[PDB]
């Protein structure tokens, strides 16, 4: 996948966003922006150019699942890669993610090596 792929990292917790941004940097992905919830994410997505989304499950105003479904049903953004982040792997949340078309699913906290595996799984499936 291109080193310059533009990521949007979505989480209401600023520290987690910084952590994810820094793990991405460690993997060679420097083109990264932040959003604090689904509403803020959709506003930033309007700038165009975004190539990858990493979103937390639980956020105010619009949570991760709502954002995922919105992107998937959007005329322009429907195929955008979306990695969902959760606090705990639960059958019901995994299946909710599957049903809505999550490109990936990962439990926080995660290492750079785990992030890399998950991104590579997605790149491989999408031929990126």
């Amino acid at each position: 996948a291109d080193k310059e792929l533009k990521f949007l990292v979505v989480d209401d917790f600023s520290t987690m966003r910084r952590i994810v941004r820094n793990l991405l940097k460690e993997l060679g992905f420097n083109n990264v922006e932040e959003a604090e919830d689904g509403v803020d994410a959709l506003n930033k997505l309007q700038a165009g150019g975004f190539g990858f989304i990493i979103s937390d499950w639980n956020m105010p105003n619009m949570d991760g699942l709502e954002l995922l479904k919105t992107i998937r049903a959007d005329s322009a953004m429907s195929a955008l890669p979306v990695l969902m982040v959760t606090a705990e792997a639960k059958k019901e949340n995994i299946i909710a993610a599957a049903q809505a078309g999550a490109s990936g699913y990962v439990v926080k906290p995660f290492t750079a090596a785990t992030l890399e595996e998950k991104l590579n799984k997605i790149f491989e499936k999408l031929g990126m």
Binding site: A89, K90, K91, I94, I95, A98, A102, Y105, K121, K125
Partner: peptide, 14 residues
Amino acid sequence: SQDQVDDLLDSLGF
């Protein structure tokens, strides 16, 4: 159930 979860993730390519 842990194993149903890991299998579920595997089947989904997650």
